[PDB]
Amino acid sequence: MLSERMLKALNDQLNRELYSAYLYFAMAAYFEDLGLEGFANWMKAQAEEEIGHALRFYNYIYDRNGRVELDEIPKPPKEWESPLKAFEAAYEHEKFISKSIYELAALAEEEKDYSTRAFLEWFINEQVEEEASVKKILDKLKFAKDSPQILFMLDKELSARAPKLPG
Amino acid sequence: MLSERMLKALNDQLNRELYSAYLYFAMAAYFEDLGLEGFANWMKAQAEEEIGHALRFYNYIYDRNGRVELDEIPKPPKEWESPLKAFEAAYEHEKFISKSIYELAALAEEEKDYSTRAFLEWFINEQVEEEASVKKILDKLKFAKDSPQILFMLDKELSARAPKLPG
Amino acid sequence: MLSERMLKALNDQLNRELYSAYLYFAMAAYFEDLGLEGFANWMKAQAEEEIGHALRFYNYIYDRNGRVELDEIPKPPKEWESPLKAFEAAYEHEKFISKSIYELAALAEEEKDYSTRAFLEWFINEQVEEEASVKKILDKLKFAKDSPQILFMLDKELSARAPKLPG
Amino acid sequence: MLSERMLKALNDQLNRELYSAYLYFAMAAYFEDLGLEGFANWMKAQAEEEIGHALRFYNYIYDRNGRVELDEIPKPPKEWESPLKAFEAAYEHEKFISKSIYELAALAEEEKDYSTRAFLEWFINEQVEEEASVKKILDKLKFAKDSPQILFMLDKELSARAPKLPG
Amino acid sequence: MLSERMLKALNDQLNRELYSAYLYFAMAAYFEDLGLEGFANWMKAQAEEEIGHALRFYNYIYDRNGRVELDEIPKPPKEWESPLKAFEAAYEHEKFISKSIYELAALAEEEKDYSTRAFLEWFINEQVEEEASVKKILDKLKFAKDSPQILFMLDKELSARAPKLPG
Amino acid sequence: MLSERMLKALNDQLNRELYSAYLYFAMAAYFEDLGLEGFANWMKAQAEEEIGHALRFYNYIYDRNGRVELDEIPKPPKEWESPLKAFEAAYEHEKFISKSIYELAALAEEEKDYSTRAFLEWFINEQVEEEASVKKILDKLKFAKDSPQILFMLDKELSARAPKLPG
Ligand SMILES: [Fe+3]
Ligand SMILES: [Fe+3]
Ligand SMILES: [Fe+3]
Ligand SMILES: [Fe+3]
Ligand SMILES: [Fe+3]
Ligand SMILES: [Fe+3]
Ligand SMILES: [Fe+3]
Ligand SMILES: [Fe+3]
Ligand SMILES: [Fe+3]
Ligand SMILES: [Fe+3]
Ligand SMILES: [Fe+3]
Ligand SMILES: [Fe+3]
Ligand SMILES: [Fe+3]
Ligand SMILES: [Fe+3]
Ligand SMILES: [Fe+3]
Ligand SMILES: [Fe+3]
Ligand SMILES: [Fe+3]
Ligand SMILES: [Fe+3]
């Protein structure tokens, strides 16, 4: 009840979600190094959220009597010219993930797989939230052009988002 | 204050820890497919634990004013002849990690890197626990051999261990 | 991320929501004049609800990186021949809001704009409720055709629903 | 508001849901007479859940100002060759309901009936959950091929789920 | 301990109880269509109650080492000329069920099946309550003759009896 | 008890208050668009307050046995050159509402309408507060001429004024 084609498409997205976790982890390491601990914490929390997204794909595949297959996780970029550029890349990256979702939605419509299409509604809606969140910080970073004072401040605000795992 | 060898070595250990997260996750998918939800949830818990280990290097590295670098994470194996064989691989894998910790310890001693070597004590003691914990289960499995009545009971026990994240 | 056709239909639907708030406020004022303070309040509660619906569009717009534009709000009718008529009016108004939404859904599908299509599901569902709830009363006012005892009773019932804001 | 074609199809699904409740009540009796009280209670609770499904249809039909009409409920099977063959029937049956739902979804789309499509969305996700929960147990019964020992411990696990009407 | 006859007769009453539930559900749909929400809830509560009655039979039957057989449940009337006539139809059905209980009892006494006769004692008493319950309402609907304003208040009186399952 | 002219002057001021809600809501969209979420929330709260002022007239008109008549709320401006400019436009708006209220006091005095003139005392005081409330913010904006860091902190302060409706 999953087509061989759809399974590959779902396992592929599961892999994109994990890569997406890892990129944020890479971004955390990058903010860490800049000393911006709040930014860094936000990125870890984001990383954890992406692992969550991956598990959602994992559970759906099992629910549909499929079989998860795990693929290499590409090595993410090490750095970025500035916090603003990191967020630009996060944004571009969320835009990339959405497109993959639409493509998945399209394939599910074409196959007449209502289950998978329904399962994806959740990601269509979550991605709206995901892009808006990244956009909102990206713009504050624009508005903070030649001003470390504001960078410092945003850093403190973002630190309110703590990754749920360590403790 | 970390020599470039040390930094490279901690980073490789960080990546080894992530690979284990992933190998264990790969094991969770293998059990899930067999419909052994107890084992499946044990592997996901084990997988989070490994991410934890990963962050300890992360944390240590930054404390010594290093820079983390994330590397690609290899495709894990997909399948195993049997639950026993997967636990065997897990056991063999932990033995692999323990040897790595020793190689790192020896590295830290030769360089007279007291800080790093202190940092590794935690890993020497944890790896004793890790090895013993997988062996216990692996032995319970040799004991079941040709008894699904026991795999059933083993599954159920193991379901006691659950991953934090989903919640 | 929002096409120009979408942006327009969304602001339009936002202004359509604001005008319902005003229409219902108009009916509140009609009911008040008939001394029917129960109906008048329920209408004021419905206005507040419509403003809520307008804020839902306002938010989705900004989330999709859009720009809200506020247009003029037409003067609503002043009078109706009877309580039954004003509810008939309000039912037809809801059936009209509904079709404005179906129209938005249709546009979204033509443009292959999954996020917007997905965001409207909520409105499709709320409208089912909106229509059913206006209808339940409408029905109770046909039963109460020529008999002010029941009209007087409905009034007390509907005063249960109060507007939250004057608090 | 509801096309004749649509309303008759919804009434037909309502009847389908009731025959489901009846089918599982039939499985409940089949299991009691085997002295599998756990199995029997599971099936009872399932029956109740199906009545709930029938009520969602009833509610939706009335919310669209339609009219429910009840058709006769056919006599269900009395017996199955074994607990496994019984769960095979249930699984084959949940698939049949899924198809009925997909067919309905296709009909709503074809007639541009957005409201009914949105309503059916809950059944597309619920059926995913339905088929999975029957498959987990179906597979457990395969894994207990010739083994009353496991059958007995399944019966005891299933007894956790219990019908609410005795209360 | 149950003769072929008693088993047959009992499995038959079980079915009538089920049909009874179905019939009340049918009147629930009828009252709901008229916009009589109170009356409609009352009838759904009565339907569950009848399912409860079926369960007592089901439980007695397995108590005596019998086997429950389920039979098809016939189409009930869609429609009544008025609320009063539904209630007349209701009452007549309750007397019909009572008569079938008495025959059951009488067959018990004849075969000298003390256990079965004793089981029915519950139903003998419950039926007294059932008929009285229906008659009170029946009679109040007569008292309401040409008074929508009374029917309104009766509906509101009845909304206090609510079905339990939806929760 | 209300002169034909008074009612008209009261209904106009009612409408003026609604237009105020709209104006402030426009300025909300404006600030939202700049990503100044705190100004945006302030403005949404003030929008609500304005709706409150309208209801005050609405209540008075019905107390004195008048009828409320609602008029078209015109299109407010979409844009302003800067946040400071918006607050200048709002001060100017409030000053005009004030003038509007004096004209109403003068009228009621001149018509020797004592009820109406006393009703307005509330507004004469409220406008003092309104004007000053805007002036304080407007002046802080002058104070923060070419300093985005002060714009930022002022945004965080105003964020404390939350509208009361999203809940
Ligand atoms: Fe994601
Ligand atoms: Fe994401
Ligand atoms: Fe998110
Ligand atoms: Fe480890
Ligand atoms: Fe380990
Ligand atoms: Fe451990
Ligand atoms: Fe609305
Ligand atoms: Fe509405
Ligand atoms: Fe509503
Ligand atoms: Fe169902
Ligand atoms: Fe089902
Ligand atoms: Fe279910
Ligand atoms: Fe009964
Ligand atoms: Fe009865
Ligand atoms: Fe009773
Ligand atoms: Fe005002
Ligand atoms: Fe004001
Ligand atoms: Fe004020």
3-state secondary structure chain F: CCCHHHHHHHHHHHHHHHHHHHHHHHHHHHHHHCCCHHHHHHHHHHHHHHHHHHHHHHHHHHHCCCCCCCCCECCCCCCCCCHHHHHHHHHHHHHHHHHHHHHHHHHHHHCCCHHHHHHHHHHHHHHHHHHHHHHHHHHHHHHCCCCHHHHHHHHHHHCCCCCCCCC
Angle (CA) A146-A147-A152 rounded to 5° is 145
Size of interface C-D (CB pairs under 8 A): 30
Q: Tell me which chain D residues have a C-beta less than 8 angstroms from the C-beta of B35.
A: 136, 139-140, 143
- Residue A30, classified by CB atoms within 10 Å of its CB into exposed (0-12), middle (13-18) or buried (19+), is buried
Buried b (16+ CB within 10 A) or exposed e, B18-56: bbbbbbbbbbbbbbbbbbbbbbbbbbbbbbbbbbebbbb
List chain E domain ranges. 1-167
Give kind and range of the element (H or E) at residue D129: helix D114-142
Q: Which residue has the tokens 């609602």?
A: F70
CB count in 10 Å sphere of residue A83? 21
3-state class (DSSP) for residue C35: coil
Give the residue among C66, C76, C40 at the shortest CA–CA distance from C158: C40
Closest to E148 (Cβ–Cβ): which among C136, C139, C150?
Answer: C150
Is residue F62 exposed (0-12), middle (13-18) or buried (19+ Cβ within 10 Å)? middle
- Exposed, middle or buried by CB within 10 Å (0-12, 13-18, 19+), for C151? buried
Q: What amino acid is encoded at B160 in this protein? A: A
Interface of A to C at Cβ within 8 Å reads: 98, 101-102, 105-106, 121, 124-125, 127-129, 131-132, 135
Binding site annotation covers F49?
Answer: yes
Tokens 């008759």 sit on residue? D8
C-alpha–C-alpha distance, residues D137 and A20, integer Å: 35
Q: Inter-chain contact C124–D118, Cβ cutoff 8 Å?
A: yes
CA–centroid distance, residue A142 to ligand 11 (Å)? 53
Nearest-angstrom CA–CA distance, A16 and D126 = 27
Using an 8 Å Cβ cutoff, are C60 and C10 in contact?
yes
Alpha carbon of F33: minimum distance to chain C alpha carbons (Å): 6
For A114, the closest of D95, D105, D135 (CB atoms) is D105
- Residue of chain C minimizing CA distance to E152: C150
Contact criterion met (CB below 8 Å) for D105 and A114: yes
At D154, which amino acid appears? L
CA contacts within 13 A on the Cβ side of A113? 22
Question: Contact A115/D129, CB-based, under 8 Å?
Answer: no
Residues 6 or more apart whose CB falls under 8 angstroms from that of A76 comprise A19, A22, A23, A25, A26, B70
Distance CA A51, CA B25 (A): 11
Contact residues for F122 (Cβ-Cβ < 8 A; gap 6+)? F56
C-beta atoms of C115 and A132 within 8 A? no
Torsion from C-alpha of D14, D16, D22, D25, nearest 10 degrees: -100
CA distance B105 to chain A (A): 24
Angstrom distance (rounded) from CA B148 to CA B140: 13
Write the residue in C32, C68, C78 that is nearest to F62 by C-beta.
C32
Chain A interface, Cβ < 8 Å to D: 1, 60, 62-65, 112, 114-115, 117-119, 121
Report the alpha-carbon distance of residue D74 to residue D167 in Å, rounded.
28
Beta carbons of F148 and A143 less than 8 Å apart: yes
Q: Widest CA span of chain B, in angstroms? A: 56
A-interface mutation test, from C63, C114, C119, most A Cβ less than 10 A away:
C114
Stated in angstroms to one decimal place, the resolution of this structure is 2.8
**Which residues on chain E are in Cβ contact (under 8 Å) with C136?**
35, 37
Min Cα–Cα distance to chain A from C52, Å? 19
**CA Rg value for chain A:** 17
Partners of F165 on chain C (C-beta within 8 Å) are 48, 51-52, 55, 164-165
Per the listing, tokens 């789309």 go with D109
Which residues have CB under 8 Å from A118's CB, separation 6+?
D121, D124, D125, D128
| Residue of chain A whose Cα is closest to the Cα of B15 | A75
State yes or no: chains F and A have 3 or more CB pairs below 8 A: yes
Residues of C with CB under 8 A from a CB of F: 22, 25-26, 29, 32-33, 48, 51-52, 55, 58, 62, 67-76, 78, 164-166
Task: Measure the CA dihedral E149/E152/E157/E163, to 10°.
Answer: 170
Secondary structure of chain A: what % helix, strand, coil (to 5)?
A: 75, 0, 25
CA distance F27 to F90: 9
Give the closest-approach CA distance of D145 to chain A in angstroms.
20
The β-bridge partners of D73 are: E73
Q: Is C129 annotated as a binding residue?
A: yes
Contact yes or no for E104/E120 (Cβ under 8 A): yes
End-to-end CA distance of chain D: 39
Find out whether D126 is annotated in a ligand binding site: yes
Question: Who's near B133: CB < 8 A, 6+ residues apart?
Answer: none
Q: Which residue of C has its CA nearest to F75?
A: C72
Annotate F31-55 with three-state secondary structure.
Answer: HHHCCCHHHHHHHHHHHHHHHHHHH
Fold category of B1-167 in CATH:
Ferritin (1.20.1260)
Q: Known binder of ligand: residue A53? A: yes
Amino acid (one-letter) located at C54: A
Q: Interior CA angle at C27 toward C40 and F163, to 5°?
A: 70
